[model samples]
Target: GSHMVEGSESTTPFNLFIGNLNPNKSVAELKVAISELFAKNDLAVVDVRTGTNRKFGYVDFESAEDLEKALELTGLKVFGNEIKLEKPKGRDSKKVRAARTLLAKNLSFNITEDELKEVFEDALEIRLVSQDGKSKGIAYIEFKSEADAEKNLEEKQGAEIDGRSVSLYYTGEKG
Candidate 1:
């Protein structure tokens, strides 16, 4: 029951981030009827699934026109609880750009921007991933070229970031 893959990887451009789901509702319960429910709303709901943890879900639609309407479903109650929805920043649901990006993790919330810059001064830029004004303890660091990114990626086993232990992996995304 513990096996899981972090949704941090493998989200598509069409996959809407669905959260605030009623945890009492099992993934099966939601996954079964979620798409049809959206279809009732006139969306071309094509795919749906709860996150591995069952605390959230994702929905996909083929029509951007209806996708816009799907946003209205946010905060709408389902099974007596409200749901939240978010759209992808990139509409091109194709694939990663392979832009020399790394996904950093196990970082301390106390870690700041400058501290990360010190870790990789050659980094084209570093973004401390956050939500609700709190750092998620994840950083998406970017470099100018594959060589720079690969070299830095090799150097940091993430044993420490700002004196705190961390981990890093390629994600090719700023988010």
Candidate 2:
């Protein structure tokens, strides 16, 4: 049996989820991209696992301290790509998303009002980003059911609302 991924999740400790890739422009150089980016902060990027289409990747840092330092560099214009950064919330790593909520990290760029309301029809508790509540492109939409949220993310990964669409994660994935 292929129990590698099944073994209680061999969680990468110092991890960060980085997305919002320019798939057409920079599709397959996350390791070089992130390594050079972190090299700016004098931090070393330990490993990188690129996701489908090179649209996103998970980054590992040398240590928790370095990871925090690396996070300080989020939202930067790295090689002309605007990347979003999020660290793991806990050590439990299956990324368990019993989440009935869907997350759009880059919605402000293009999501129009009518399209926005379409999701709001079933969405509950809009969670804005930032500690100051001044977030523009982040939307947390709670679905009436988990299945509904799951379907949307898979289908609408990048259907284009207004601004450039990026990775779609279930709520708890990047908390």
Candidate 3:
């Protein structure tokens, strides 16, 4: 996909901040579109709040478990424009949490924390192995400095780990 949604984080569960929306798009229309889009996942749009002067809005789900489904809609198109679906982060800007953490995805199930630490020497902390289910092959690595994390993200973006091609990207997620 040629689209990307800047991710966000908020304490509110099942809440999302959808940006880059067609400014004139109606809240009712967006609610219908999102409801249909997440129907397969058994998720429903509980609320849609937007302003006539803003290019973004908020969408709420019935349950926290549906948050992942909302994330999956990051690059979804609404009113013919790809919208940005991100966790609702109140008033904090994305830059507030831009560095220090990186996500390693498509990792091998056999990979371990030590192996990852070895690959990225600047890692100051490695999250629990399978803490969030290692079977998902995802882990969060925190560096002492944002510069180190950014450097490693560039150096290992597509680097292979354990014979499987892995991907790296700076994330707002904390371990």
Candidate 4:
């Protein structure tokens, strides 16, 4: 073996940020499944912010081939939960808003109202801010307009907050 891609640090492996996993599954469970489905390889189930819950986790395999194989064989039954895989997203950075939609995930469960105000209040006059009880453990940040939302989306996307990779995106209202 010893292909260049395998050893190449510059070439990012196909890492999947997975969601909708059974709440009962543990990191070891994922590792075992990945090992069984793909060539024996190393995997890192990381939730650096400790934000990872039973429902979601990140799997970084040695290569994209491994990831694809796992995805095909495992399909949607990762730990008995239909899983969704996609590239990890960054957070919003824009400060202005006018009729825009913002979506955020991987937020600190312990994030406080004061911290939210101090961090994003300056960007836009927040019309509304809400959090999931017990942290869904995520948050939804709203802006006044599309411009403001875009600013937050661009600058804050993938911003690490409280050690978690807080990802953000803009979704039009109603899908």
On lDDT, the leading prediction is: 3
TM-score each candidate.
Answer: 0.48, 0.40, 0.39, 0.36
**TM-score of predicted model 2?**
0.40
What is the number of residue pairs that collide in model 1? 0
Q: Ranking under TM-score, best-scoring first?
A: 1, 2, 3, 4
By summed lDDT, which 10 consecutive residues of candidate 2 come out lowest? 1-10
Question: Which runs of model 2 end up more than 4 angstroms from their true locations?
Answer: 1-12, 87-175
How many backbone clashes are present in model 4? 26
Predicted candidate 4, C-alpha RMSD: 14.0
Model 4 stretches astray by more than 4 angstroms: 1-13, 25-51, 91-127, 130-175
Candidate 1 global lDDT = 0.63
Query: Cα lDDT of all candidates, in order?
Result: 0.63, 0.59, 0.65, 0.52
Model 3 Cα lDDT, one tens digit per residue, 1-175? 1563344354345667777756465755774565567665556666666644554567777775676666665645666877666765545434445356777777666677767876787877776345353266676676666778889878877667857767677866432
Q: In model 3, where do residues sit more than 4 Å from their true spots? A: 1-99, 128-134, 173-175
Candidate 4 yields a Cα-based lDDT of 0.52
Q: Who is ahead in TM-score, 2 or 3? A: 2
Over 4 Å off, model 1: 1-16, 39-44, 62-76, 89-111, 125-145, 153-175
Report the number of backbone clashes for model 2: 4
Clashes of each: 0, 4, 1, 26
Itemize residue pairs with steric clashes in candidate 3. Answer: 130-134
**Cα-based RMSD of candidate 1:** 9.4
Model 4 lowest lDDT segment of ten:
42-51
